[PDB]
Amino acid sequence: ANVFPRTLKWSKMNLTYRIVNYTPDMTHSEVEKAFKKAFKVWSDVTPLNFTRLHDGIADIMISFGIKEHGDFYPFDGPSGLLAHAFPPGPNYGGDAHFDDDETWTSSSKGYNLFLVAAHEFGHSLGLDHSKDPGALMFPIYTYTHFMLPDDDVQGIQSLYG
């Protein structure tokens, strides 16, 4: 017999992701770099490892979309909601969706994809929003040599050690 675990977390440390499609605002290479750097934020403070698949079903499926894109969290055009992600689990669990009505960059202009991805992948791993205004998991985007704040390190390590 088996029981569902209490806290939402991945039961395995070696996770896969797939970049399903790409925003027009950055080159493939830049998009790949941003998401890879964003996984590294979490892998540098946990035993978690992330491997990219080029097709098939991955633990974390990453896609860009606009307005209605196949869930109950439709996007809203430029600005407003930037992205959202589902907490760990089967099926849609772990998936991260980014609004392609935003202007995505590797810079201080528009919305920085790496920074937003780093936040969203926190959700993909089981972190909810923080009340700490300085935290990566605070629910409001602010742009910033990025260092993961203590609140997020504590949060993610309470899940994965």
Ligand SMILES: O=C(C[C@@H](Cc1ccc(-c2ccc3c(c2)OCO3)cc1)C(=O)N[C@H]1c2ccccc2C[C@H]1O)NO
């Ligand atoms: O919660 C969400 C949506 C959220 C998405 C979102 C993306 C990134 C960050 C963030 C926070 C701190 C950081 C950082 C990024 O990089 C360094 O330090 C916070 C929230 C959003 O789109 N936030 C919007 C929001 C929410 C409330 C009020 C205003 C706004 C404008 C946007 O910031 N999905 O998971």
Ligand SMILES: [Ca+2]
């Ligand atoms: Ca939007």
Ligand SMILES: [Ca+2]
């Ligand atoms: Ca999935």
Ligand SMILES: [Zn+2]
């Ligand atoms: Zn979505």
Ligand SMILES: [Zn+2]
């Ligand atoms: Zn969030």
